[PDB]
Design a binder for this molecule. Structure first.
Ligand SMILES: *[C@H]1C(=O)Nc2ccc(Br)cc21
Ligand SMILES: [Mg+2]
Ligand SMILES: [Zn+2]
Length: 160
């Protein structure tokens, strides 16, 4: 359908097991009123490559910022040459909460994260399962850092 937003983000992959070590992938994200989709970006030709996956907008319960990592690697650190840094540095995380727990996405800028959150909140406005609570920190190594709850589906420890 009609593309609301199109961006290059760093995403934290869903793992085989919660113990398994984290993997981050650079992908192009597409937002429509029906889907949040992601692709392997074709840099050379300047196009979206292969679709890797999608989340139905109706399945989204929450969209918020996430408290940043205590000590991120350079790829997720605050930058400097604008065209370059907007595709190399991804310091601003946000979460897309759905059926299969939270999806963690890293924006190159604060402004782009704000645009994505603003638009994602609007496309989810008429959803049923919209939660009023959320986890401000990341689920990492079998637990959320903000409340120590050990279930990805656990109810939010903070009111939004
Ligand atoms: C990233 C991943 O590992 N799995 C998944 C599913 C849907 C989206 Br939009 C993104 C990701
Ligand atoms: Mg560089
Ligand atoms: Zn929490």
């Amino acid at each position: 359908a009609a593309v609301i937003l199109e961006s290059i983000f760093l995403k934290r992959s869903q793992q085989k097991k919660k113990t398994s070590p984290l993997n981050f992938k650079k992908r192009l994200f597409l937002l429509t009123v029906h889907k949040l989709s992601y692709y392997e970006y074709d840099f050379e030709r300047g196009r979206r490559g292969s679709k890797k996956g999608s989340i139905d907008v109706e399945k989204i319960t929450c969209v918020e910022t996430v408290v940043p990592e205590k000590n991120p690697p350079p790829e997720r650190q605050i930058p400097e040459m604008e065209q370059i840094s907007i595709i190399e540095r991804f310091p601003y995380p946000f979460q897309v909460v759905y059926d299969e727990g939270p999806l963690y996405v890293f924006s190159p800028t604060e402004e782009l994260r704000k645009r994505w959150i603003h638009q994602l909140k609007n496309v989810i406005r008429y959803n049923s399962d919209l939660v009023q609570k959320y986890h401000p920190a990341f689920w990492i190594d079998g637990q959320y850092l903000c409340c120590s709850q050990t279930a990805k589906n656990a109810m939010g420890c903070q009111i939004l």
